[PDB]
Amino acid sequence: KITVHFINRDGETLTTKGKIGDSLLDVVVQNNLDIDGFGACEGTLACSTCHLIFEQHIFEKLEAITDEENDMLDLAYGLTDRSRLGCQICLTKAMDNMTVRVP
Amino acid sequence: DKITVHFINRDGETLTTKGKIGDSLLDVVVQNNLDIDGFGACEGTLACSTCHLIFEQHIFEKLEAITDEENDMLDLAYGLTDRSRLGCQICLTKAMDNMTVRVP
Ligand code: FES
Ligand code: FES
């Protein structure tokens, strides 16, 4: 299991654990993280609520983005150069102790 | 609450409740605890399509003009029709009394 920190929109840092292979939405849902609206479509690429902003060194080694994710991601609020839809990103060793930001 | 709205749920059952002019249809659903699975998940912030509703033609054609934002998100909705709108963007007016909207 690995530690993941979430900077929520209110500014509070949510520290929690997930298992390698778990999506970031899985992490939010299982641990009942208090992130308003997160995971609206329950990970079917029909919403932008699971948008997360990653550290650059983490972002650059994420799995190649699919066109389906990109179309949904295009509509997210507060898009950055390090943005992905969290329901598509699964935990890896390199993410231990990483921080993600909820825009 | 002064006007009646009939919601045809995904199971084909009709849920009837009331709201006041000025409320969104999302408000009407969530404030009355209607049993519509996952409806309103992004909380009216135009970031999902879980509040998708299908309107009868005579009501649909009287609705407020759809924004590009709403249209862009509605495009990717399940069961999108010509008479579809995002419910959280639709404010109740007096004309909507006894209208029927359907959840795909
Ligand atoms: S939960 Fe909707 S696209 Fe990620
Ligand atoms: S509740 Fe998400 S867009 Fe209407």
Mutate to test the pocket of ligand 2, among B27, B28, B34, B48 (most ligand atoms within 8 A of CB): B48
Tokens 């495009």 found at: B75
Question: Are B48 and A41 a contacting pair at CB < 8 A?
Answer: yes
How many beta carbons lie within 10 A of that of residue A81, not counting itself?
8
Distance set, CA B104 to CA B43, B52, B60, B77 (Å): 19, 7, 16, 10
Q: How far is CA A28 from the centre of its chain?
A: 9
**What tokens does A99 get?**
């921080």
End-to-end alpha carbon distance in chain B? 25
Ligand 2 atom nearest residue A37's Cα: 2
DSSP designation for B96: G
Question: What experimental approach yielded this model?
Answer: X-ray
Q: Does ligand 1 come within 6 angstroms of the Cβ of A85?
A: yes
Ligand 1: centre distance to CA A87 (Å): 5
Domain boundaries defined on chain B: 1-104
Resolution in A, one decimal?
Answer: 1.9
- What is the fold, at CATH topology level, of the domain defined by A1-103? Ubiquitin-like (UB roll) (3.10.20)
CB proximity B47 to A under 8 Å: yes
Tokens 């209110």 found at: A10
The superfamily in CATH containing domain B1-104 is: Beta-grasp domain (3.10.20.30)
C-alpha to C-alpha distance for B10 and A70, rounded to whole angstroms:
29
Q: Does ligand 2 come within 6 angstroms of the Cβ of B44?
A: yes
DSSP designation for A66: P
Distance set, CA A9 to CA A3, A49, A102, B4, B64 (Å): 19, 12, 6, 36, 31
Indicate which ligand has the atom closest to the C-alpha of B45: 2
Segment holding A68, helix H or strand E: helix A67-73
Could you give the angle at the alpha carbon of A21 between the alpha carbons of A4 and A5, nearest 5°?
Answer: 5
Tokens 């045809």 found at: B8
Q: Which residues pair with A15 in a beta bridge?
A: A5
CB proximity B36 to A under 8 Å: no
